[PDB]
């Protein structure tokens, strides 16, 4: 809108900063945020976030010069500390959506780089994303949007030991089961199933958890939540979504998903699906259930 010229400015700034070598990039970024900090709260929405992403890029650039420069691990620590301060400057300016997303990005980067004390940086950045989720977000569809990003980000992380992985794991399931509206709980809790299956900690020799019993608990708890919904359209729409989620783990060789469980739910959808209003909404829901049945027929 108004700040096309300020975005385009910081745009150019980062592009030209690629010409400076890594040691000097840090120095110039630190004076950039000092300058861009002067412009007050509505400007920094647009000018600071590029500095956080350049901080992340710089950290990767130091890992490239790992065997050249033996102080590379202290340099990364310093950059993530800078990133944490830059993201915190957005919070004081009364922002939540963006800094939450910037914090998740920083946890991903720290986890991938592997500098000494990276797990602690990654945890702090994740736990900081959770605070902003809890303390500063309460609009059902924006909640669901936020927590899918936390879950999806957390699912790619492999740098946590079991002692840190577990509190984060159950916090996602806890958080997911308490969204404002009942249909959005069903989705989020079932989305959480992937954390127990394809999530990695550093005790397993880098291998996926495959906690199939917890995978089911999420889905059993997702069905429970679907029964109590306030619209027969959404109730069924969520039954068909959970059915496809069982099929996801069924095909991935999860022992705890048996054909009995699938048949129970397809019959349950066969019973309730004729008891809906004739609409554009229920035509797409019917086509979805057909596609699921057709998919089960192959494999």
């Amino acid at each position: 809108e108004d700040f096309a010229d300020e975005q385009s400015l910081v745009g150019r700034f980062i592009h030209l900063l690629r010409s400076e070598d890594p040691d000097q990039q840090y120095l110039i970024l630190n004076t950039a945020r000092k300058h861009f900090g002067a412009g007050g709260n509505q400007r920094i929405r647009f000018t600071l976030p590029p500095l956080v992403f350049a901080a992340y890029q710089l950290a990767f650039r130091y890992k490239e010069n790992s065997k050249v420069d033996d102080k590379w691990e202290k340099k990364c620590q310093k950059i993530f500390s800078f990133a944490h301060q830059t993201i915190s400057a957005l919070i004081k300016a009364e922002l939540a959506e963006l800094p939450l997303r910037l914090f998740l990005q920083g946890a991903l980067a720290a986890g991938e780089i592997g500098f000494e004390n990276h797990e602690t940086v990654a945890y702090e950045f994740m736990s900081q994303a959770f605070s902003l989720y809890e303390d500063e977000i309460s609009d059902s569809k924006a909640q669901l949007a936020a927590i899918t990003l936390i879950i999806g980000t957390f699912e790619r992380m492999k740098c946590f030991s079991e002692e840190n992985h577990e509190p984060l794991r159950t916090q996602c399931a806890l958080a997911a089961s308490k969204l404002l509206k009942k249909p959005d709980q069903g989705r989020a809790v079932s989305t959480c199933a992937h954390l127990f299956w394809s999530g990695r900690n550093t005790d397993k020799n880098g291998e996926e958890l495959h906690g199939g019993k917890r995978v089911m608990e999420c889905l059993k708890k997702a069905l429970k939540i679907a029964n109590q919904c306030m619209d027969p359209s959404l109730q069924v729409q969520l039954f068909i979504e959970i059915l496809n989620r069982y099929i996801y783990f069924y095909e991935k060789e999860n022992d705890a998903v048996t054909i009995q469980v699938l048949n129970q739910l397809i019959q349950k959808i066969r019973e309730d699906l004729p008891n809906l209003e004739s609409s554009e909404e229920t035509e797409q829901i019917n086509k979805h259930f057909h596609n699921t049945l057709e998919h089960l027929r192959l494999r």
Binding site: R12, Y56, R101, E112, G152, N244, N291, T292
Partner: protein, 182 residues
């Protein structure tokens, strides 16, 4: 009918423009439709897209400041029912089984997604999947050698020819893949 498929520009967060040679190829009056996977992340890039074609469809990326963009979109172009989503919603990210799960929900012949910044075009279970990659070649935490790329779809009745443009070094290079509907 031909459709430009691009996304994850991340201007100004990770990049400041498309590469030189892409701005030369992408000029008005040549392309009927544009399907965009999101993360523009601003009007400066949107309005530029709006002067490349009349019909431009855009779904909300995880860093788009505009809420008026929907989470997903289904649009029909000729015989193909095409599904559009950014892909941060598809968990685990870039997973085949989760992407096919989403194909069944929308009921589409082609699914376009883009959270990975990694180009992919392939058929699976007689259904087609495009990821144009990042057209700026933007930073992603999980992939370190990002190749600036976009996709041109040439649709003719019951057939689609997808062309992938990639900036490799200084050179724009093209490959072609072809999908026919059953």
């Amino acid at each position: 009918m031909l459709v430009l498929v691009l996304g994850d520009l991340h201007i100004p967060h990770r990049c400041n423009s498309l590469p030189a040679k892409f701005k030369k190829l992408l000029v008005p009056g040549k392309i009927q439709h544009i399907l965009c996977t999101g993360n523009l992340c601003t009007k400066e890039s949107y309005d530029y897209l709006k002067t490349l074609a009349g019909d431009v469809h855009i779904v909300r990326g995880d860093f788009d400041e505009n809420l008026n963009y929907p989470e997903q979109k289904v649009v029909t172009v000729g015989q193909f029912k095409i599904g559009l989503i950014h892909g941060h919603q598809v968990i685990p990210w870039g997973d085949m089984a989760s992407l096919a799960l989403l194909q069944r929900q929308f009921d589409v012949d082609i699914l376009i997604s883009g959270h990975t910044h990694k180009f992919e075009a392939f058929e699976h279970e007689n259904k087609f999947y495009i990821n144009p990659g990042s057209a700026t070649g933007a930073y992603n935490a999980l992939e370190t050698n990002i190749i600036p790329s976009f996709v041109l779809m040439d649709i003719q009745a019951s057939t689609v020819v997808t062309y992938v443009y990639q900036l490799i070094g200084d050179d724009v290079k093209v490959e072609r893949i072809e999908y026919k509907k059953p």
